[PDB]
């Protein structure tokens, strides 16, 4: 088996929030279609799979010219992990070697250029994850964590809470748009974060995650320059 | 000198962002007035001081029936620390014993009831800070910090990045609305965070910080039930 670069787009019919989110249109193209177009235009992938339990989602994926894996109910439930869906898609097409990239349709401003830029960071020898990330609005060192009921401790030092942000290490959070992994490592570890993890930095604007009707319009407003 | 409970409201004329922010009206009352009303209605304070360099701000403070400390230019500049303003106000009225609470006008949804609730957490024997805080939208353990150029490390463990949030310690960030300190300790430490710090938890809604015109309207929308 030669190595393959696989993109997996997980899109279930009964999304846990906004109804029918994956097929909602933005600029005349479904969220699903925006992410398929990003995958195709990246030219990074040998195979692009949409994994779904819904008939309308499957028909949309076929109309965009990509492969469909049908997920049974037990893998498309509110308790089913994303990793189990990706593993199932890989098993269905018979790939256990190469790279596998998770592209969630809820990140419609992540483009094919972003995907190519992220892919350029992947190290084929060391094989840690590449994860897209954006800067933290609120610095995570300026927080306290609960240790006992009503008792809290600084994330690191109490003095960090008053430090000028520019004097603190730069901080980033995964934004959900892109997770790139070595396929065999993802199968063995059964997770998306595999050390040593590299970050592909994206802007706040491009990192928008669609959960609400207002996220949809904001994303549309951004697309208009 | 008997102990006094002092509230200090820092309000300079040349705020670093929105122009004339401290006197902008919300529901027919200036931001400054909302915070003065919170201080008065809390009944927590022996003295309420507005520290300012601006004539219009001073006149507003006098119209609400509180004391005014005039800050010279060197203490009302873009580089002047908040702590130096509070220290100057305390020196001006001659208080070095009791408690001192910083109330920023940019937190107009923080009420007198919030202040009283926060004050009830202050420990007069141990004398750590009480700081108002709100829950973190994005969990601070699900972040990576820059260590070298293009190299990042998990805040704590890489496995935290995939942990269900409810399995992680609860996390909070100071929201800027209330800082309560022992006066002598604040003078000695020259900072607002003094161990052991206790948190007064506020909702996201009540924690709104005014920096933009849209923050102003959102805060007004919230005031309407
Ligand atoms: Ca091809
Ligand atoms: Ca520590
Ligand atoms: Ca009185
Ligand atoms: Ca660590």
Swiss-Prot record, chains A, B:
It catalyses: an N-acylneuraminate + CTP = a CMP-N-acyl-beta-neuraminate + diphosphate. GO terms for molecular function: N-acylneuraminate cytidylyltransferase activity. Its EC number is 2.7.7.43. Its main location: cytoplasm. It comes from the Bacteria. PANTHER family: HAD SUPERFAMILY MEMBERS CMAS AND KDSC, N-ACYLNEURAMINATE CYTIDYLYLTRANSFERASE-RELATED. This is N-acylneuraminate cytidylyltransferase. The gene is neuA.
């Amino acid at each position: 088996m030669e190595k393959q670069n696989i993109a997996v787009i997980l899109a279930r019919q009964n999304s846990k929030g906004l109804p029918l989110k994956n097929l909602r249109k933005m600029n005349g193209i479904s969220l699903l279609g925006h992410t398929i177009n990003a995958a195709i235009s990246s030219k990074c992938f040998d195979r692009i799979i949409v994994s779904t339990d819904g008939g309308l989602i499957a028909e949309e994926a076929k109309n965009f010219g990509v492969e469909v894996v049908l997920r049974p109910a037990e893998l498309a439930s509110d308790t089913a992990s994303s990793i189990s869906g990706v593993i199932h898609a890989l098993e269905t097409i018979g790939s256990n070697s190469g790279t596998v990239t998770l592209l969630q349709p809820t990140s419609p401003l992540r483009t094919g250029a972003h995907i190519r830029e992220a892919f350029s960071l992947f190290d084929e020898k060391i094989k840690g994850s590449v994860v897209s990330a954006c800067p933290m609005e609120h610095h995570p060192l300026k927080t306290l964590l609960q240790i006992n009921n009503g008792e809290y401790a600084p994330m690191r030092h109490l003095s960090d809470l008053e430090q000028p942000r520019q004097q603190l290490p730069q901080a980033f959070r995964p934004n959900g748009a892109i997770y790139i992994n070595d396929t065999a490592s993802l199968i063995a570890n059964n997770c998306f974060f595999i050390a040593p993890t590299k970050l592909y930095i994206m802007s706040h604007q491009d990192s928008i995650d669609i959960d609400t009707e207002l996220d949809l319009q904001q994303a549309e407003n951004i697309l208009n320059h």
